[PDB]
RNA sequence: CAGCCGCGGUAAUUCCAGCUCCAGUAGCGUAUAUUAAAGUUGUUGCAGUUAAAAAGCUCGUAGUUGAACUUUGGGUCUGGUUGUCCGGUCGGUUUUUCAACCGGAUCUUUCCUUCUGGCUAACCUGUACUCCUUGUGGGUGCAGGCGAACCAGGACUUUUACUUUGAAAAAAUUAGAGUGUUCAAAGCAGGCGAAAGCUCGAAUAUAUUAGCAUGGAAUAAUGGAAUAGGACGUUUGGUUCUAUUUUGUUGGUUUCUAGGACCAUCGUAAUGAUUAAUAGGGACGGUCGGGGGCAUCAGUAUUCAAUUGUCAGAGGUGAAAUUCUUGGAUUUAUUGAAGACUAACUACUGCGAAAGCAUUUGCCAAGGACGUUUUCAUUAAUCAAGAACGAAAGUUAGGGGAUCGAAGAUGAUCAGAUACCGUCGUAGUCUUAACCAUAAACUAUGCCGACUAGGGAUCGGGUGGUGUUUUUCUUAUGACCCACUCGGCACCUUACGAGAAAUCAAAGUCUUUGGGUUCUGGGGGGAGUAUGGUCGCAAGGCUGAAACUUAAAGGAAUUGACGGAA
RNA sequence: GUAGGAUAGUGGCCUACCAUGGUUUCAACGGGUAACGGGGAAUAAGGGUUCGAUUCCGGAGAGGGAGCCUGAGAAACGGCU
């Protein structure tokens, strides 16, 4: 077996073809071309994004775990687009309120799901300009209402 | 035939034996038989896979019908070798 | 391993060692040309001349006791035909096959075969433009085809 | 392609400021002025024995043959006083370490001192730009017959 | 067809040396195997060899010594620029220290460290290691 | 909390705090990209029998590739370059006893491009023969003349690719030499005196694509003399020239002549075709075949009908029933019509590119295998464009319709069952004219090539057997037996070769990775969908997404458990 | 192609008259680029892969598109219309 590929002196260009053709079944690289993070993926193919807290929402946990998970669902600014973030460590909810702006950042999965949390592809980061860890910890204080 | 067969001189027996195509050298085992005909006293150089209704060098007596492979010499024919 | 059947096959033609005239066959090279012209004249192909000359006399082949071959001689005398010989034979297959598709509408394995065969002459007339034999801008087809046969 | 009528134009054409003088008397009349284009070319006869006249010949005109030259097979000899030289060659890839057989076609001007036909190995030199895509000037067809005289096969 | 036939008597002396014959028949018999064969003998991998004149191409035997391992072929004859020799010896051969990389080029058909020697390289043929 | 695995259900080492403790440390976390890891994009370097993956099949232009063959070998000197032989030496250097290694000149049937001339350096020389140890140690020296010591101009180069060294690829960057920024990251500085002046530096290397330059002639192609219109040249004629140099200088004409070019004829030479690939084509020969088309023959077998006979049921059943006639249905016997099909034969049998193809004979062409001292000489291998076929069903349009028989009626069974089972039975099934172009079109194994381990068979060719029988006396065909031979539809062991393993003599010769090619695949789903194209009468086909979703989906086997399997 | 016109000059740059070419599966043409090009950057066995708005070299542009003055040099925008 000469196995696939031509193994010629002069078989570079149709050697180069294939690779291509190849390429789109790797779906990172397809992503990469295609612009699919810029044409949709709520976030402009972005690390982070301020978006209005529209409302605070508990959805529930996908399988063994079972909980409510106390997400947000949150109106980007730039692009218009409604998601739903999760809150990460105890309360945080509270302190997250309603109405506030809130940076988003991605949970960690290049998009996807994280775990148990159904339909939910966020961290809240910061609530109106301050840091959700921070004001767990009890280091900084909240600037007011 | 293992190991240590010393390929350059077989025995003849195994030449005979493999094709005539795969040996050391190409050599074919065809012959032409020169045939005297019944009437006439003359002898005809007939290789003997013919591929032909072989008459003689004029006369009208076919001296060999072409089989597939060596040719079946018609009738009461006498031939020398080679 | 053959061109177009799935049949791989060694029906084959050995060739003696010998380059030089197996010594006591006799005659003359001369006359052994003289004869292939005879037969070339008379309508015989040069693989049919070359067949009677093996067969009933005692030459075994031209390269052999002329040192020239059998077509290169006829071509030195001015007998080859236009179309080589296997060209010639392999169109004339194609045209029986036209022929007999013509003749019964509905045959695939006739057609298919007939195809093959055209496919096959086409080849080889590319091969004779490309040697100088058959001049060239020249398809050696279907409807002319019949026509160049005859 | 084309040639023969000589002069065949709404105007009609000499080489410039070179004289045929009516009050001498000449054999040629005309007098054929010519270059000898150098770098070992030499001028065929065709060019300095004729009548056409050509801007763009090398060996008749004001065209100057430098810079770089080239060779090639000719493809198309359809258009008026010019070729398609198609020069073939071989792209190196790294990646794979091979190469392709590429293209690169060259329209290249042909003075009538030359027979330039379909398939015909050309030889040609750099020069002025004359037209649109004519950069280059034929100076020596190599394959002058490429077995035209012996055709025929029968002795 | 037969491509590339100093490459099939190459893979025939292999499967030969695997079985643990002491001989190997090679049909074709080109310059270029001749070339290789010589190369090999004068390394030290290699017995006789004999060209039989089948009035024709050719017919080559081999007395197989033991001691080929493999004597391999790479496929289209790649282009070497003296440094990249360096290179093809690391992917084909086992260590810095011995095997060849039998390259032809405008001396004749040497191996790499000839070739090194000799300050003229060109396009591979196989390797012996 | 947890990237993932996961932890949480009253004993949390995973949540929330203290102590301990780890890691990194003036840093460390998170998010998204991206590189590595990913041989999970593979040229190096992957997979496709089953895990995703071989187009159903063959044809086929591009492309990619492609058998072997033309200058090999020996001698004779001559340059180096490090190990050696002592340091011959004031830790370094110069030869010899030796070496391998790399060149160069040559001579070997051998030209390295050839000449028109310049310079002929040199002595192949020998013109006077001797400055002089008894000499062939040594050179003042110029008519014939070795030209390689260089030019300076022709003549015309087979052309590449490949590789060589070179010249060019701005600095910064990168690599990298030197140097005490206190160290470094850096930076191009510095360093030394009488410290009156002097003084090292600011390197080198890379970048390979294309062009330029030169050496090399292996490899790979290309080219040339086969109507020789061929090569040379003391040809001998010629033909077309072109044309400068002297005839005082212009305009001629013709010369001598020296350079083109072009047909003759004379000579010269070894005058000119490599093989004929267990490559390929084609002829020939006997054959082989359920290969194809067209044409007929059988069995028939079922069904309806005809005539024929006999008086209670026969059909059907899966255990069981419904269901049909009796004014003999069935059953018995002869026919007729129709369109079907073509058993038995029938096999680890044969053919065909697959799909597929089994009664008869005939016709019509084609085909492999074989055999061949036949013929051509690279026509060859595989293929994206496109092409040829292509099961069944379906389709339109025609013929028939026996049975089975999606639809539909209908009889039971079960909680129910328009499901089996049951009875019937439009479309079809079958065919003929058009399409369609799909299949578990499956050997779930692309093609071509080569090589590696035993064995018997088995089909088709073909050899040899004083073999046996046929028997019309020797026979000669035929038909076996046996051995070998090539050929396709086929077991056992070890695998050292493989493979995840089932298994595999190929699915082997693969990390000891490269024979030649086409095609396909890259977690599962979403999805063969959406969309657009295109192809169709349609049904559908070819083509073919993403969003979004998810941690498994698979494969192979192992032990179990289980099974209205044995 | 021929001729002109123009230009600092070459040139279908433009005009007249004629010819029918020219490119293309060795992907022309079209579409996309969250593309200014290169030096280079990141990664780093070998082969690679991705990035290069950005200190250097080129090229474009001065809200868009157009036009021009002056001038050796601009189709300038810290000139004009
Ligand atoms: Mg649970
Ligand atoms: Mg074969
Ligand atoms: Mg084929
Ligand atoms: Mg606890
Ligand atoms: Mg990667
Ligand atoms: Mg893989
Ligand atoms: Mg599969
Ligand atoms: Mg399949
Ligand atoms: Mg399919
Ligand atoms: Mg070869
Ligand atoms: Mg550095
Ligand atoms: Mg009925
Ligand atoms: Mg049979
Ligand atoms: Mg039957
Ligand atoms: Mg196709
Ligand atoms: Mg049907
Ligand atoms: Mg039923
Ligand atoms: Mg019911
Ligand atoms: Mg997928
Ligand atoms: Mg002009
Ligand atoms: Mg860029
Ligand atoms: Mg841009
Ligand atoms: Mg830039
Ligand atoms: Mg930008
Ligand atoms: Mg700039
Ligand atoms: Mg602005
Ligand atoms: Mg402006
Ligand atoms: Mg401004
Ligand atoms: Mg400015
Ligand atoms: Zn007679």
Redesign the interface.
């Known amino acids: 077996m000469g196995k696939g590929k031509p ?3 002069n078989s570079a260009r149709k050697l180069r073809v294939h690779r291509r053709n190849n390429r789109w079944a790797e779906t990172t690289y397809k992503k990469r071309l295609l612009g699919t993070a810029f044409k949709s993926s709520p976030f402009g193919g972005s690390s982070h994004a301020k978006g209005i807290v529209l409302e605070k929402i508990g959805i529930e946990s996908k399988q063994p775990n079972s909980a409510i998970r106390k997400c947000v669902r949150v109106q980007l600014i730039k692009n218009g687009k409604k998601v739903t973030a999760f809150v990460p460590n105890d309360g945080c909810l509270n302190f997250v309120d309603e109405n506030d702006e809130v940076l988003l950042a991605g949970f960690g999965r290049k998009g996807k799901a994280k775990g148990d949390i159904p339909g939910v592809r966020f961290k809240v980061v910061k609530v109106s300009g301050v840091s959700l860890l921070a004001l767990w910890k009890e280091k900084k204080e909240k600037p007011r209402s | 035939m293992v ?6 001189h077989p025995t003849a027996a195994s030449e005979a034996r493999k094709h005539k195509l795969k040996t ?3 050599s074919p085992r065809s012959h032409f038989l020169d045939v005297k005909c019944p009437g006439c006293l003359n002898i005809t150089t007939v290789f003997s896979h013919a591929q032909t209704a072989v008459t003689c060098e004029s006369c009208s007596t076919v001296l060999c019908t072409p089989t597939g492979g060596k040719a079946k010499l018609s009738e009461g024919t006498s031939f020398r070798r080679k | 391993g053959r061109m177009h059947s799935k049949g791989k096959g060694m029906s084959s033609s050995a060739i003696p ?3 030089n005239a197996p010594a006591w066959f006799k005659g003359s090279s001369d006359g052994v040309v003289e004869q292939i012209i005879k037969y070339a004249r008379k309508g015989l192909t040069p693989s049919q001349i070359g067949v009677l000359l093996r067969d009933a006399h005692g030459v075994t082949q031209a390269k052999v006791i002329t040192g020239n071959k059998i077509l290169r001689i006829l071509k030195s005398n001015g007998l080859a035909p236009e179309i080589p010989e296997d060209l010639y034979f392999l169109i004339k297959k194609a045209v029986s096959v036209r022929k007999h598709l013509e003749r019964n509408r509905k045959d695939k394995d006739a057609k298919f075969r007939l195809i093959l065969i055209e496919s096959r002459i086409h080849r080889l007339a590319r091969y004779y433009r490309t040697v100088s034999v058959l001049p060239p801008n020249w398809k050696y087809e279907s409807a002319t085809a019949s026509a160049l046969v005859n | 392609s084309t040639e023969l009528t000589v002069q065949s134009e709404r105007a009609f054409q000499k080489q410039p400021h070179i004289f045929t003088n009516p009050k001498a008397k000449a054999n040629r009349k005309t007098k054929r002025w010519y270059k000898n284009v150098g770098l070992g070319f030499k001028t065929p006869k065709t060019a300095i024995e004729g009548s056409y006249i050509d801007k763009k010949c090398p060996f008749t005109g004001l065209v100057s043959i430098r810079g770089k030259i080239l060779t090639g097979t000719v493809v198309s000899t359809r258009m008026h006083r010019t070729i398609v030289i198609r020069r073939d060659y071989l792209h190196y890839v790294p990646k794979y ?2 190469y392709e057989k590429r293209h690169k076609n060259v329209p290249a001007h042909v003075s009538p001192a030359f027979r330039v036909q379909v398939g015909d190995i050309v030889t040609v030199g750099q020069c002025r730009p004359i037209s649109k895509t004519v950069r280059f000037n034929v100076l020596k067809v190599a394959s002058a017959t490429g077995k035209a005289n012996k055709q025929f096969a029968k002795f | 067809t037969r491509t590339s036939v100093l490459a099939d008597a190459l893979n025939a002396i292999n499967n030969a040396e695997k079985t ?4 190997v ?1 090679i049909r074709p018999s080109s310059k270029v195997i001749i070339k290789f064969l010589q190369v090999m003998q004068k390394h030290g991998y290699i017995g006789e060899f ?1 060209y ?1 004149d ?3 191409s050719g ?1 080559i ?1 081999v007395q197989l010594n033991g001691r080929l391992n493999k004597c391999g072929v790479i ?4 282009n070497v620029k003296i440094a990249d020799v360096e290179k093809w010896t690391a992917n084909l051969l086992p260590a810095r220290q011995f095997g060849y990389v039998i390259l032809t080029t405008s001396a004749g058909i040497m191996d790499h460290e000839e070739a090194h020697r000799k300050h003229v390289s060109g396009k591979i043929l196989g390797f012996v290691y």
């Not at chain 5, 496929?75 to 790649?78: A, H, L, N, T, V």
Request: hydrophobic fraction near 35%.
């Open positions: 193994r010629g002196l | 190991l240590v067969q010393d390929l350059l050391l050298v190409q | 060692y010998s380059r | 370490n091979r | 643990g014959k002491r001989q028949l004999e039989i089948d009035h024709r017919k035997v496929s289209p004859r790649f």
